[PDB]
């Protein structure tokens, strides 16, 4: 099954209200202008429990298991116009402290600065930093894995005649060191009577 988990799957990061049944659930809104103070997105690293990940290929496979271990790949693709340029700071903050409220705080954690260009995708690899060898899929505070946030490193600059609002998509997969165990039934399927 780990072969399946290592395949990128689109992440409904924008799991907001109303856009739970659109395609926009898979799009992170970004735009030109002075919006550095405004955070782009943020979520907890709960690949099988958080609503952001639990229904992805990685999340669904994990829900059949009680323990998981290994690194996670978050691939971000810029889906704007080729004439749009920008830079973003993708940060992973291990647990122990509240989520950052500013780019200064997030930069202090594990981060990568993404430059938009001919290569439209960048990968933020979440390393396995845990006191335990395994984490619970039904994560608690003891097995918390941290958070991921994005900030405008510089911003988005576009020329005349170019759309000012752009979108980003996030894909999630498992690295080659990922592993799960303790097979269990999944809570995403239920019935009340024989079909």
């Amino acid at each position: 099954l780990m072969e399946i988990a290592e395949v990128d799957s689109v992440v409904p990061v924008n799991n907001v209200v109303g856009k739970l049944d659109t395609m926009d659930i898979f799009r992170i809104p970004v735009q030109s202008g002075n919006h550095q103070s405004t955070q782009v997105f943020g979520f907890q690293v709960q690949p099988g429990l958080d609503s952001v990940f639990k229904h992805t290929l990685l999340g669904e496979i994990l829900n059949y298991y009680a323990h998981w271990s290994g690194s996670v790949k978050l691939t971000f693709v810029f889906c704007g116009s080729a004439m749009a340029t920008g830079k973003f700071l993708l940060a992973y903050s291990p647990p122990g402290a509240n989520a950052p409220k500013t780019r200064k705080d997030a930069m202090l954690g594990t981060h990568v600065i993404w430059d938009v260009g001919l290569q439209s995708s960048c990968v933020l690899c979440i390393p396995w930093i845990s006191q335990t060898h395994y984490r619970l899929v039904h994560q608690d505070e003891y097995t918390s894995a941290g958070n991921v946030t994005c900030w405008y490193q510089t911003g988005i600059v576009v020329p005349a005649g170019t759309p000012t609002l752009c979108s980003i998509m996030c894909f999630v997969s498992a690295c080659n060191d990922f592993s799960v165990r303790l097979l269990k039934d999944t809570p995403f399927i239920e019935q009340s009577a024989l079909l």
């Binding site: 799957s9 659109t22 395609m23 992805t56 889906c79 116009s81 005649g161």
Partner: protein
Amino acid sequence: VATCRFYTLESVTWEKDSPGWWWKFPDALKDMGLFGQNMYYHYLGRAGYTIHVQCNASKFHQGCLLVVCVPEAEMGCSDVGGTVNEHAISEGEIAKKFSATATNGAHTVQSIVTNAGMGVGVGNLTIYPHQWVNLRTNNSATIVMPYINSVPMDNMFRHHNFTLMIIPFVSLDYSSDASTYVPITVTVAPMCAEYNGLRLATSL
């Protein structure tokens, strides 16, 4: 050489609000020259496919498409109690269109794009062979699909081996006076086609 060649289907218009399109194969080619003719006179068929999708737009257009081939894309009916018409799955060279909302009606597919007409996560379709068409990056997608089935050969009319889906995750967007018509064109070529069970042509 008479069947293993590129056939181009009718193009589709990618609008700002376009849930997506799909085509079932080999039904989509039941009228493509001698490839369709061999299909009508034979009981068994077996062919790989080279699918080429084309969508060209300026560098001032932004958009992203998902081109994915789904083996055994058994669709589901909007009416949970009932079946689907062949017409609800495939119109031949004409594409079936997804929807941005739940669909109703008798014998019609539940074509809400989020569930992909199969009761699954649309974002999880990357497990199948797939490519993306990011207008800032590329303008075409190519997938080489061999023959996948639980049997060495099968009837091309009674069975749809795989379904080709095109789903824009990022809606097409442009500016004041850029080109508004951005089409998507699909070109498919059978590969290593074989036929068996020669007899009179079937009639639909």
